[PDB]
Every structure is written in C-alpha cells, then in structure tokens.
Amino acid sequence: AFLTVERMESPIDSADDLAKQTKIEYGAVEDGATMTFFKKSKISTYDKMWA
Amino acid sequence: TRIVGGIWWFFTLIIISSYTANLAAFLTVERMESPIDSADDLAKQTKIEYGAVEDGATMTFFKKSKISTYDKMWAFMSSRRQSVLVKSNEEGIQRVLTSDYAFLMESTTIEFVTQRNCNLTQIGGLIDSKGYGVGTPMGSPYRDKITIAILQLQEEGKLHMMKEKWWRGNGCPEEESKEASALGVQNIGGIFIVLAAGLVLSVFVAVGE
Amino acid sequence: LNPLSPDIWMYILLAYLGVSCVLFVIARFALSTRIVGGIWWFFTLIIISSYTANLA
Amino acid sequence: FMSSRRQSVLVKSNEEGIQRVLTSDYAFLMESTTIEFVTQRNCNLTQIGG
Amino acid sequence: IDHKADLAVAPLAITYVREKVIDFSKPFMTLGISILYRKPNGTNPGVFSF
Ligand SMILES: *[C@@H]1O[C@H](CO)[C@@H](O)[C@H](O)[C@H]1NC(C)=O
Ligand SMILES: *[C@@H]1O[C@H](CO)[C@@H](O)[C@H](O)[C@H]1NC(C)=O
Ligand SMILES: *[C@@H]1O[C@H](CO)[C@@H](O)[C@H](O)[C@H]1NC(C)=O
C-alpha cells in the first residue's frame, strides 16, 4: 500500500498530473494573467486548474 | 541455535515481503495506467499531442462542436495551430510515427495507412456523422438511377471483395486484441532458467565428487 | 489462475516434476541437496511473488 | 451531443430500449418510476442516477 | 458552378451545408471520422523480467 501510494502519484508530475493531484500546493499571482486564461478558455486539465 | 534460526526466518520473510510489495506496486501502477489512450477521448490529458489537419473535413466537423468532450479539444488545437495542427494527412501520419500524436481523419484512410504500416494504431471509429456517395448538383433522375443501382449492388454479394482488395495491401501480421492479465512467457522464463542452471550445476558438482 | 497462462501452468508443472525426479535420483544414488533445496525455495519465492503481484 | 448524434440510439420505446441496453454498452434515459419498475421486474438493471 | 460535369464520383462527405448547396445522392458508403495513434511499443525487461 505504501509503495502504491508513493508510485500512483507522478514523481515527474508534468503539467496535467498537477491538476488531478491535490497534495502539492501551487499558485501564482491572483488574476495576474495566470488564471485569466483559465477562467475562460475551457480546457479539461486547465479547467481543473481553474477550479 | 534457535535464535539464529528464528532471525533467519524473519530475514527471509521480510525480504520476500519487500519483493512481493514492490513487484505488486509495479504491476498495479502499470495496469492502472491505460496502455492505450481513452477510447475516442483525448480529453483530461492535454499532454499527448492530438488534432487533425488544418481546415480539413474533421476540422470543419469539430470546429462547430460544442460538446465538452470535443469543444475543449477544438479550443486547444485552435490555440495551438502552430504545433498540434498539420497541413496534410501524410504529414500528420509522420508526426504520429515520430512522436506521440493523435490524428483524426476518415476511418478508411486510417485503416489503409495502418495496413500500409503496422507502426500506427487505431482505437475508435464512426465518431462523426457522414456518408460517401456520388454527387449531383441538381435535382436530377440519374442520381436516383445511380442510388437504386447501388442499392441493388449491396443486396447481391460483390461489394465486399472489391472493397477489401483495395485495402488488402501486404498481409497484416496477427496481433493480439484481448490480452489478459496473465504473465508473459518471457516474464516468467527467467526463474525457470535460473532454477535449471542451479540444478544442473548442483548435479555436476554432486557427480564430480 | 488468472495470473498464470495455461502454458505458464504447464511450465510450473514440468518444473515441479523435474524437481521431484531429481530429488528421487539423488535419494536413489548433503551440500548438493542443500543447494537444490535453496534454489527450489527461491523458485517458489519468485513464482508466488509474481502470482501475488498480478492478482493483487 | 444528442442532437449531434440524433437517432443514433434514439429508441422508439422502452420495449426495445431495454434490449438495446442489454445487448451493448447502452445507457437509458427515462422517467424514474418506470425505471425502478423495470429494475424490479428485470434484474441486471439499476437506476445509476438519483 | 458552371455545371460542366453532371457527376462527381469521389468520397463525398455529405454535410448539411454541402447538401444545401449540392443536393447530393444517397451515400453509397456510410463512414465516419476515426482516431489515429501510434502502435504500442513493447519494451520488455527480457527473459529476466524479475
Ligand atoms: C516501424 O519503424 C521502424 C523505424 O522507425 C522500422 O524499423 C520498422 O520496420 C517499422 N515497422 C513497420 C511494421 O513498418
Ligand atoms: C456484461 O454485460 C455486457 C452487456 O450484456 C456484456 O457486453 C459484457 O460482456 C458483460 N461482461 C461480463 C464480464 O459478464
Ligand atoms: C514507442 O517505443 C519507444 C521506445 O523507444 C517508447 O519510448 C514509446 O513510449 C513507444 N510508444 C508507443 C506509443 O508505444
């Protein structure tokens, strides 16, 4: 179980892998052209990022 | 000699426990990930390249598509026309061959290409509503004649052979379609080889003395 | 039996029969027996490990 | 989506929709009361939605 | 546009706008757009898979 927990998460966590996971915290300037493209322009993983 | 026997017992138990745990972890992580992409669904990925040709028939169909399984794809490929969008069908096929890319034309073209080269795969099909037939600019009767001739052509058996001989090409090698979770022959043969080598060396050193 | 293919089952059966036959030959004909027992134990360890992993 | 795929799985009635469900990976969309009525009458079916 | 050729034999995906401008005949073939991808590549760990 420990090994599956540590391996199901993506160690390289490239782009879309960050959307599904929630353990790692992430963010940027609030509405500083970062999530302005994410509130609109619905893209699946980008929509998860906006959410 | 009870303490050493017990500690050896626990040693073997914990080592085999770690071996089983790590191997099981590898199997679960590889099986949980779908070996193929989601059937006719490139969504929720946004990492593997996907799209079609620029301003093709598929582009026309999915540009005016508001379904979330398709509108997000359309928006992304319109935003990234410089990278994920190609000009010609063969260009997209080559892009798929060189690197991970998803390409979207008529099923007949895809199957023709995969018969001409077994390096690219096909997953879904008939995700678009269309039909192929002869054309007639006006409301003529000869189009009706052609349609009734075609319909009487399907009712008799000739279409299958002529249809397939066009797409036959080279013989398609037999490849699995319903593989199960059982381990492969090469996946288990290593322990057989190791056991056989150990046994033959043991027999040789026993008969030598 | 999902973790093992029928051919894998045949391989396991032939390995078991070979181990039994070589043990009988050794009996009819201790370090060599110790090595044989150890390698057979390890064989069981890896095969059960693969079985557990796949069905898990 | 259904407009984009009209009459593709649009059954004429439940008396063919149930067989369409039982013959493939087909999901039905009907009023509730009939749905649990069918599930009680015919097994292998449950109202997945609430 | 000049109606030079009364017929055009080719794979003609009969879209709604195309049907509006050219009243096409009944589709000889029923087909649809399909997905393309690279064949899976097996990087096996060899006979010593363990
Ligand atoms: C796939 O491509 C490789 C080189 O990229 C080539 O060696 C191989 O023959 C190709 N496979 C088929 C089935 O054409
Ligand atoms: C489950 O039922 C569906 C619909 O009849 C069928 O296609 C599928 O093969 C069945 N699977 C199993 C494991 O019974
Ligand atoms: C193709 O094979 C390469 C091996 O270099 C591998 O890295 C890649 O993931 C494979 N791609 C597919 C789609 O199987």
From Swiss-Prot, chain B:
Tissue expression pattern: Highest expression is found in the olfactory lobe, piriform cortex, dentate gyrus, hippocampus, granular cell layer of the cerebellum, and in caudate-putamen.
Any extra remark in the record? The postsynaptic actions of Glu are mediated by a variety of receptors that are named according to their selective agonists. This receptor binds domoate > kainate > quisqualate > glutamate. It does not bind AMPA without coexpression with GRIK5.
Q: Which residues point to the Extracellular side?
A: 28-187
List S-S links within the chain.
118-172
The record lists L-glutamate as bound by 57-58, 106
Impact of changing residue 119 to Q on the protein? Loss of glycosylation
Q: Where in the cell is it found?
A: Cell membrane; Postsynaptic cell membrane
Cite the record's note on assembly. Homotetramer and heterotetramer with GRIK5. Tetramers may be formed by the dimerization of dimers. Assembles into a kainate-gated homomeric channel that does not bind AMPA. Can form functional heteromeric receptors with GRIK4 and GRIK5. Can form functional heteromeric receptors with GRIK3. Interacts with DLG4. Interacts with NETO2. Interacts (via C-terminus) with KLHL17 (via kelch repeats); the interaction targets GRIK2 for degradation via ubiquitin-proteasome pathway.
Gene from which the chain derives: Grik2
- State which stretch of the full-length protein is shown: 633 to 841 of 908
List residues traversing the bilayer.
Answer: 7-27, 188-208
Identify this protein by name. Answer: Glutamate receptor ionotropic, kainate 2
Task: State which residues carry a glycan (glycosylated).
Answer: 119
**What the entry says about post-translational processing?**
Sumoylation mediates kainate receptor-mediated endocytosis and regulates synaptic transmission. Sumoylation is enhanced by PIAS3 and desumoylated by SENP1. Ubiquitinated. Ubiquitination regulates the GRIK2 levels at the synapse by leading kainate receptor degradation through proteasome.
Role? Ionotropic glutamate receptor that functions as a cation-permeable ligand-gated ion channel, gated by L-glutamate and the glutamatergic agonist kainic acid. L-glutamate acts as an excitatory neurotransmitter at many synapses in the central nervous system. Binding of the excitatory neurotransmitter L-glutamate induces a conformation change, leading to the opening of the cation channel, and thereby converts the chemical signal to an electrical impulse. The receptor then desensitizes rapidly and enters a transient inactive state, characterized by the presence of bound agonist.
Q: Describe the family membership recorded for this protein in Swiss-Prot or TrEMBL.
A: Belongs to the glutamate-gated ion channel (TC 1.A.10.1) family. GRIK2 subfamily.
Q: Which domain of life is it from?
A: Eukaryota
- Coiled-coil stretches noted in the UniProt entry, renumbered to this chain: none
UniProtKB/Swiss-Prot annotation, chain D:
Where is it made, tissue-wise?
Highest expression is found in the olfactory lobe, piriform cortex, dentate gyrus, hippocampus, granular cell layer of the cerebellum, and in caudate-putamen.
Report the superkingdom from the record.
Eukaryota
Q: Write down the glycosylated positions.
A: 44
Where it sits in the cell: the answer is:
Cell membrane; Postsynaptic cell membrane
Q: What is the effect of changing residue 44 to Q?
A: Loss of glycosylation
- Sequence positions that bind L-glutamate: 31
Entry PTM: Sumoylation mediates kainate receptor-mediated endocytosis and regulates synaptic transmission. Sumoylation is enhanced by PIAS3 and desumoylated by SENP1.
Function, as annotated, reads: Ionotropic glutamate receptor that functions as a cation-permeable ligand-gated ion channel, gated by L-glutamate and the glutamatergic agonist kainic acid. L-glutamate acts as an excitatory neurotransmitter at many synapses in the central nervous system. Binding of the excitatory neurotransmitter L-glutamate induces a conformation change, leading to the opening of the cation channel, and thereby converts the chemical signal to an electrical impulse. The receptor then desensitizes rapidly and enters a transient inactive state, characterized by the presence of bound agonist.
Q: How does it assemble?
A: Homotetramer and heterotetramer with GRIK5. Tetramers may be formed by the dimerization of dimers. Assembles into a kainate-gated homomeric channel that does not bind AMPA. Can form functional heteromeric receptors with GRIK4 and GRIK5. Can form functional heteromeric receptors with GRIK3. Interacts with DLG4. Interacts with NETO2. Interacts (via C-terminus) with KLHL17 (via kelch repeats); the interaction targets GRIK2 for degradation via ubiquitin-proteasome pathway.
State the family named in the UniProt similarity comment for this chain.
Answer: Belongs to the glutamate-gated ion channel (TC 1.A.10.1) family. GRIK2 subfamily.
Q: What else is known?
A: The postsynaptic actions of Glu are mediated by a variety of receptors that are named according to their selective agonists. This receptor binds domoate > kainate > quisqualate > glutamate. It does not bind AMPA without coexpression with GRIK5.
- In Swiss-Prot or TrEMBL terms, this protein is called Glutamate receptor ionotropic, kainate 2
Source lineage: Eukaryota, Metazoa, Chordata, Craniata, Vertebrata
